[PDB]
Amino acid sequence: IESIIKTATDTVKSEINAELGVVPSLNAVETGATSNTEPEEAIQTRTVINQHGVSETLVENFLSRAALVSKRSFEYKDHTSSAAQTDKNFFKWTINTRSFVQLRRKLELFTYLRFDAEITILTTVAVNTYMGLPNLTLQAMFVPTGALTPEKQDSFHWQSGSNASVFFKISDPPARMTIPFMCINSAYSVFYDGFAGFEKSGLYGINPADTIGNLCVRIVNEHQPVGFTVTVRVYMKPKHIKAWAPRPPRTLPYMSIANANYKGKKRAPNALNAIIGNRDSVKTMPHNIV
Amino acid sequence: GVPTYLLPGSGQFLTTDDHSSAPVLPCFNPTPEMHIPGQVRNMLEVVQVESMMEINNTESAVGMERLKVDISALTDVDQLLFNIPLDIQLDGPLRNTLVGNISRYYTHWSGSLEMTFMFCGSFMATGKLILCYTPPGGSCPTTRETAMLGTHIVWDFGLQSSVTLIIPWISGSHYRMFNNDAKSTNANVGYVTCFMQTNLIVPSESSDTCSLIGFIAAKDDFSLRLMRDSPDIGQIDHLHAAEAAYQ
Amino acid sequence: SDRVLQLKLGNSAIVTQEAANYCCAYGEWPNYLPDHEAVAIDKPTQPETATDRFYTLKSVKWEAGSTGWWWKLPDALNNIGMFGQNVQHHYLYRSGFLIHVQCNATRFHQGALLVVAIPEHQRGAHNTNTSPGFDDIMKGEEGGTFNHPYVLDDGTSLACATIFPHQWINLRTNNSATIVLPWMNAAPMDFPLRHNQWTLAIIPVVPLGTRTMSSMVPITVSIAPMCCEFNGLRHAI
């Protein structure tokens, strides 16, 4: 039954027990229920007034940590003889939570998530001699998924009629935006057991309703006579979080961001056929006190 | 105007700060909330669900053979079957559990544990085991005379094929640390050992080697604090197709 | 008292005598879609006893080196009975499921099955970075076989798979498992031919073993849809 739990529960004292018909330490794993044997029923306990709060394991606290989701370095220079596969003073990024594995395993502890995401953008610059670091203006434009993204630094898509842009400088504090809960469903599917199109040639596991959008970031300045290397780090913090149906954590290393494929490490720990590193026997104690 | 002055800590980005920020989409209406089954509001709900221990974390135990302990009929009395190291920080049998994975996001822990053991022999298989918990201090007990002097439960295999060994919170401090020193007095929990109380006695058509499955959950006096990143996941390179999110 | 159980849905009934207390997933029971959560505005068809009835699948042979079996829902039932005809003639779909798994043997046999229902079981492939295709996922009535059930074929773990709605068939205790599933989706209704809400996984945690005469031990799966709605009537694909 649902109740409000602010601290961990208290222990009551117990006595010698010797009753027929009552066996609380015996259980039934086969029902799928966890054992309800209390510590008062297994040993003799004392009264403990437990004042240990439980507020740090709240799902709001467990997930609302600003985590790196994007890291992109591009050369900020005059791009005339640069190849067309490079970032000519701007980049595009489809917003995902799959690329960096600390937030990914943490969000994949749940099947469904409903959250607002606040987005911190940290820009840092390095000289590509030394003459000083420029205080450049960057534009981060939020483009929805599948819409027209800019193809140039100076394209006319950067004018942002209805697309939300943030203009920010390197010497400022980092730019911070709140992106709302933007799914067309009532929760994001962290896992999607399906195909996202009506044909049999779509992608497995990728629901585009889960995708936030594109993040097109340019430098508004023109090129200086020297080049610079600009690294843009994007940080996502979930907030106002509801979470449903928890899952086993991922044990094997991630291979891709598109799928849940697995290889495992070559030896234990976290190998395919051995998640926990090995000991000599089942009656061998690894860190035995001498 | 209002006379102000900036403090130390002005303009910084703490990753754990709790402020309101600018809406990127004004007058946006989120999707109406639907009831979805199984909402988790505290990660201690997850930690109280029993999950299998890899007690058989040995070589020549490949895959699912690590999730069961094979006991047999013995010809000597008072014999040790298995033992379980109780260090949740350290890569032992308790690491890949629901209580073990969520706790490695934290540094301090407190509260009682429970070990559930399900016997998976035949109906014809009889036997009695003793499941001892030893508070820390000395070595792990290797004989049954030594080990039953601590917290134990004697279990006969019958109509209920399961017991629970409550591992009580017996600590000097309020919390225990997930420090690297497993032999520390702030970290070492103690030992769990299993012995033959009588013997595994089967007839000639039961399989002579039977199995246990060990489970561990946390009780509702369990508590975790001081949050850290998990040592269970990590990368030394970008994942596959991560550059294609920029193309 | 909790060992005997008759499940009566439609013209189908199942009596069992060697059962456990059955599992309702996440404490929830199935229901129809209420008006304050509805999206599609046309009147749904609720065929009830024509579709809310047990559907028994093909049995699987529990053998020596079995790794496990999985069926995806509603994909395992999209071509069976009047459930499959309502699936193929409609665009939308909403139901829960009452899964009953049967496996018995003698009192000289041993073995344990983990019968676990997994929501949104997105699978992974082994030792490749190409995603699984359509035919790897949409098996249908026959279902599939686990390749690496120790990591649940998705890099996670079988040990922590008791966080999902599950039961056990330990052959010395019970011979059946029963899991009642509600609707488990982010959307209130769904297109049943490209998305699976539940995967029934049956996994040999303790293998089958005896020293008596060798009989075939089958594992039978009966699935009853519960509270079926169908919206978007058209032709059949």
């Binding site: 229920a33 | 309101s20 600018a22 809406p23 709900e45 | 309702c24 996440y26």
Partner: peptide, 30 residues
């Protein structure tokens, strides 16, 4: 401190102490 006109702009809501572990630990019916 929320001077924005949208409700999702606000800070994190760390006051949800409602638990129900019995939907995972005792999901059996009787």
């Amino acid at each position: 401190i929320n001077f924005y006109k949208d409700s999702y702009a606000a800070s994190a809501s760390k006051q949800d102490f409602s638990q129900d572990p019995s939907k995972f630990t005792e999901p059996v019916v009787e």
